[PDB]
Design a protein around this ligand. Sequence first.
Ligand SMILES: CC(C)CCC[C@@H](C)[C@H]1CC[C@H]2[C@@H]3CC=C4C[C@@H](OC(=O)CCC(=O)O)CC[C@]4(C)[C@H]3CC[C@]12C
Ligand SMILES: CC(C)CCC[C@@H](C)[C@H]1CC[C@H]2[C@@H]3CC=C4C[C@@H](OC(=O)CCC(=O)O)CC[C@]4(C)[C@H]3CC[C@]12C
Ligand SMILES: CC(C)CCC[C@@H](C)[C@H]1CC[C@H]2[C@@H]3CC=C4C[C@@H](OC(=O)CCC(=O)O)CC[C@]4(C)[C@H]3CC[C@]12C
Ligand SMILES: [Ca+2]
Ligand SMILES: [Ca+2]
Ligand SMILES: [Zn+2]
Ligand SMILES: [Zn+2]
Lengths: 665, 166, 665, 47
Amino acid sequence: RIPLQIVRAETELSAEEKAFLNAVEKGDYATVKQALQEAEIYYNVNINCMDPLGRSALLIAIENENLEIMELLLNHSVYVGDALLYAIRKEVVGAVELLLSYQFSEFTPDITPIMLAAHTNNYEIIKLLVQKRVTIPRPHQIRCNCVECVSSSEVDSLRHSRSRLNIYKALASPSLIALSSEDPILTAFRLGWELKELSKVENEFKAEYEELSQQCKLFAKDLLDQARSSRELEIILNHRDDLAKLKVAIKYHQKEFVAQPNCQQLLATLWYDGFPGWRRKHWVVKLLTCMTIGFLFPMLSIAYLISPRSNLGLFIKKPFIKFICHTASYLTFLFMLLLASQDLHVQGPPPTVVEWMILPWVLGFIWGEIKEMWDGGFTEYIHDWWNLMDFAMNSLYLATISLKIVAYVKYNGSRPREEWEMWHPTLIAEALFAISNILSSLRLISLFTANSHLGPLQISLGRMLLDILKFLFIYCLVLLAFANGLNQLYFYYETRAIDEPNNCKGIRCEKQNNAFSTLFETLQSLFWSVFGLLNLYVTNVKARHEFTEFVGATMFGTYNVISLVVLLNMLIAMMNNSYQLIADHADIEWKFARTKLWMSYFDEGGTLPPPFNIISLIQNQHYQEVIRNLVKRYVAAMIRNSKTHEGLTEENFKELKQDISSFRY
Amino acid sequence: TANSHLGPLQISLGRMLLDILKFLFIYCLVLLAFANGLNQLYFYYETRAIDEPNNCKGIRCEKQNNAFSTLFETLQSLFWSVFGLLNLYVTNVKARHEFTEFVGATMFGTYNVISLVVLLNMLIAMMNNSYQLIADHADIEWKFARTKLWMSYFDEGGTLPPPFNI
Amino acid sequence: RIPLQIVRAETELSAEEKAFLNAVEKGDYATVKQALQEAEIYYNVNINCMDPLGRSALLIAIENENLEIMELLLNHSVYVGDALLYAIRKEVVGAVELLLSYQFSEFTPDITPIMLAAHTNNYEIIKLLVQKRVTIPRPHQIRCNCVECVSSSEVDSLRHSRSRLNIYKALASPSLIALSSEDPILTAFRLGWELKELSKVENEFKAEYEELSQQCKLFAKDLLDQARSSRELEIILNHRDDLAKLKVAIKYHQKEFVAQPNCQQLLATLWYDGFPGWRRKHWVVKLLTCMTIGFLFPMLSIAYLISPRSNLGLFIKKPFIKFICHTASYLTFLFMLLLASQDLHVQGPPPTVVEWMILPWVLGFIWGEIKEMWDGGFTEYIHDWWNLMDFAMNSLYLATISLKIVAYVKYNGSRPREEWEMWHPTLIAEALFAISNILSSLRLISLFTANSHLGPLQISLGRMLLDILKFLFIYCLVLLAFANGLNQLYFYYETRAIDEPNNCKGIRCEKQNNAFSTLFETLQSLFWSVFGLLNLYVTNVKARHEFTEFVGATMFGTYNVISLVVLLNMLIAMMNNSYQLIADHADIEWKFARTKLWMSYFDEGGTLPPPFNIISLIQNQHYQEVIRNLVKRYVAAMIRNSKTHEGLTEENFKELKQDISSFRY
Amino acid sequence: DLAKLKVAIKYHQKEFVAQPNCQQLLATLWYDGFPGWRRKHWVVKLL
Ligand SMILES: CC(C)CCC[C@@H](C)[C@H]1CC[C@H]2[C@@H]3CC=C4C[C@@H](OC(=O)CCC(=O)O)CC[C@]4(C)[C@H]3CC[C@]12C
Ligand SMILES: CC(C)CCC[C@@H](C)[C@H]1CC[C@H]2[C@@H]3CC=C4C[C@@H](OC(=O)CCC(=O)O)CC[C@]4(C)[C@H]3CC[C@]12C
Ligand SMILES: CC(C)CCC[C@@H](C)[C@H]1CC[C@H]2[C@@H]3CC=C4C[C@@H](OC(=O)CCC(=O)O)CC[C@]4(C)[C@H]3CC[C@]12C
Ligand SMILES: [Ca+2]
Ligand SMILES: [Ca+2]
Ligand SMILES: [Zn+2]
Ligand SMILES: [Zn+2]
């Protein structure tokens, strides 16, 4: 039999001090007033009593929303501590104003009235509080090591983290940004960037910072949405302190802001400068004009080089024409590379005509690469992740040219490749040239972002590469373990290449042998076993060691099972789970990428294609006026969205009943 | 588990091992049935290792022979048939028993279809369905595992590493 | 400029006839009464006027729910047509009773007040209407070809279908089953079965019938849920007109009813008859007792056969012991079959000891099969879909025995198999025996339903077999097309087996040749190409017909692409989509299957394992009382669930305000 | 120390264990020697 009792006992009640609490709970004004005045005359009661549910007279008045009992209690000199915070958090303007005009608490001691107003995001009460000179502390830099920060973290770290989070949550309020801010858009950009940076440093508190950054981005997008004229749109997008604001938004990774329909329409208008009917055109005529502009790229380049100011001179300044010319030049370079492969008995031959034509394009590519790193900088150069492939290709081409010139200078004989050594400079140069051709042909993937059908697909594939890289580590660990074991088992029976039928050793021969004799060959065999290109008799020895053969076969079968049946199927499940979430924002990611690609062609520098490449207060006032108009529209819209819900409004009957009762009285 | 990027993945792989173990039973039953049938059919034509071209008997030789002569060899051949490392002429006899050869080929094809087209695809669907639900609590499971691993080093005992421990 | 006007013009209004409509809309009793009496005295108004929104005075009174204006209008002799239906459909009891006591319509002409009450499913109004002698028409049998049905469908088919659907929807009401039904559970079973059958016949109207059947099943399950004693539960499950109701529910496919926790607990209690602490036992001791009971199956069978009434005689009557004994007998038979494979130079040898022991088990299996078809019937025998495999295995065994006896009678020599013919009875018998062994070993899958971990998996695999069968048709069509094409192309260059290096023709040789010479070989090669067991040089000819070789290679590559890259990946997507929906009801399906398997062992017949097999108004009154109690509980619970929502009830202020105003007056 | 945490780990209270405050305290105890490990570069951490 479980003796149910009270373990933590509170104080007793049911005196006159509880009588007048329950009178206040009833709320009848006359009875409350008479009981309170009688108790005050008697001078034997207090006002510190607490109900079992955790509410007092003032808290119950807060919950019931009765201004008459509110003013009566406040004029009766009841306790006032935290009552302003409770009223602000209850979100009633009349009692907030009344309390402003004049133990156990569910409020953190660091909470300020302005902080709570910012947390609750109420425009009216926020303005009412901010009309007085109220301020907010500064949280220190992200990696501050100053004595004040180290000391405060040492005495109490949980309170410090909570205070920082509360300060940032109050600062990231859309209303508190609408007021007391000269540039709300820039403020939102910087705040979102700072919160995104803070999320990584504060590992335990990540979701809160991420949601604050998302809220800032959404506020910026909603503020942009209210523009209702092309003049206002261009003023906003061109304000600086062209398209400086758009460049800043691209830098700060504001994909929702960038992918706005109005901004995209303006960008398309700027992009299709030469053609004004490109929107209303047939696919056949678009294709025909595409070839007819791409075919005359050398003529256009020569015309611009000769006469920069002419009818044909300025025809290449348009971004679309420049993009078409660059694409045609790259396609011509790739065609030359393909034609190159279509006497081989000389040692270090002079370059042929195809290589002579290929060299100016390669030199131009390198020149264009260095200028962009000099103009952009190291961080911008490495952020693209395509410049890595560009640098690798250019370095490989430079090494190929150097090796070819070295071979030409050194060797001058005529000997067969069957007698040439394995480390010949000519052979090294051909291998590097083949790798360079592979990389250059693979470089064409970056042009898929300009298309409507392939951009999101390419963006989705790029996102999944990360999961591929993550699984590669586990696969490599398993492969290393099994290769170590197999080599340790099989390294005893190594045989020389002379004893083999065709003087061939390894797995790249018809007589596959010595598959696990060395660690490198074991790694190669275990890699090739995934695709089923390794035979089954490689796990055999010339001697009759049936136990050893069976153990090796068991190891091989276990590795095959683990690699193919379990790990490969698990990768597939991860790809599906990742792509399900990836497919949601494909449009936004593709539009951001296409905007970056489009703006990459707006600059005046580098107009020519690679082969020929080698050879101020009025604006502030206008922006302020437009920002004021947008803020007013946004405030109205968000007030309405707050009014969209709770459609079953009340107290209209109470107000009318009070009025008619007074008239009857 | 000590890393932020690999912990949930390892935890997810560990959770799926159970479904792997559950499917292994059905696969083993099917394999045992088909191996019993194939051995019962083919055990009549066993040949000695002397008559073989290289004195090699079994499936681990270039001349793959006697694949279904014994139950153990039948099990090994049916296991290796999943990865396509078993040839097609193993279902042949020196005599001209075309009916027996056709029946053996039909059994082999039925086993291949059942094992590869139906059971392997069904495992994949189960892995997706399990991982969908698994991915929800990956953070909680990884944090619990990392907390256990961290608290495994708080005790005073065993401070020294293994070579100096003895 | 789009001239917006009225295309379909109604009648004019705004006379006194509209004045008194808007007076009724206002609802002030005194003004409405005085206006109506003045208009009646004037004798110049009507009551047929209609508002632009499609409502009249009575309809607006229905919507506003004002009993005083209701009785005033009804006593003023307004039009009454369809008003009862509008009130019943508005679901207000006071005005329904008032209207019962005394053009354009949104109601189908076939709608009856009782039909609408059944559609709306209101217990109170349904009872109020049914207290009078009201009835419902009969819809005819599913495939009725009678003149009345053919004539009514000929004059108007849409109206006929609508009338049938409305009649069935009214009949399938849970409240209309609670009233006016002696056996609500049996009525719900039959109604659900009939609606499920109707869904297939009425192809256009499927979702409605399916949802009606689901509603009937849910009502039956909810009615069963209210049982609150073991006595009531067993009375319900044993009522007949043992476990007759459970057998009927299993026959009618009531998986939700069967999988109830109370029914499952009772079934488990009946199943674990011998062991009362089986729930609280260790896995090790459960396993130990499982082997210790399965090992003594022949001793237990012999003891039961000798002394049916003894301590050991009745130990096999328990269902769990019987199941264990049968499983052990089948495992022993499979072990004997395995041992069988472990002189071969004789023609038609006599059977060996292993076959002599195997024959009694095979004869017992056949005897047990025929008895079950004789006892069950053709439909029950073919519904299991395991009896098909049982029949195939038994027929194969019979054919093997017949062929063996024929060979023994006919052939008596000693000739080598290398000289035996290809159609030898001995070889045919061995092939049939191998196929029988495969089938018998595959029969063990059906025992997975008794386990908690494998049942849902087996059930899920069984559900997906249907999608496998559906995809097989498309695959077969593609294979037939490509095989026809390849054979037509390649049949010109057929070569004889003598010219081949090893006198081997076909794809089952080392020298793979004549892969597409015949249609059968083309089919076999295209089948084996899926697993990559067909080489690439089979698409070659001895002559130098490079064009023909290239065309054949192109056909082969196209077939490979279509079969492997497109069709195989599409099957996977279908399996995932099907399994997502399949995984929801796995528990219910597994519990239904396990209940069927458990009840398969409750009968007295066939107690012995296969080798030894060859050698009445008080109950009605109690059921009626229990059904009445369950109906009362269900009605209370569903009334409360109707009261669970709309928690913001009203008209309490209106009633109190009316009362205090009358007291003040 | 951390007897209640040990009991919670024994009783498989993963939600209780994965609380942000408990994780912060555990990280503080784990990174005893280095107090600026949170604010450090990947290169210097690796070094
Ligand atoms: C995977 C292939 C390339 C074989 C490599 C074998 C070893 C060199 C690897 C395998 C697993 C690795 C470990 C995996 C994870 C960790 C935890 C990691 O912990 C942290 O990073 C703690 C700091 C933090 O992330 O907050 C420190 C390195 C270490 C021990 C790694 C050290 C290097 C190991 C032993
Ligand atoms: C799968 C491979 C390794 C071949 C093994 C063949 C047989 C030895 C297996 C195949 C299916 C097995 C059966 C699958 C499921 C069950 C139900 C199982 O029932 C229970 O556990 C009841 C108690 C409970 O779980 O509440 C008893 C064992 C049995 C008959 C198993 C006995 C052993 C069987 C016949
Ligand atoms: C798929 C493999 C086995 C090759 C078989 C080739 C033909 C014999 C098949 C391929 C497509 C079949 C057709 C697919 C679908 C239909 C529609 C089908 O229409 C109905 O069933 C109408 C009645 C109804 O379902 O309400 C009549 C048979 C027909 C023409 C089939 C006739 C037989 C066809 C031509
Ligand atoms: Ca670049
Ligand atoms: Ca049966
Ligand atoms: Zn500081
Ligand atoms: Zn009829």
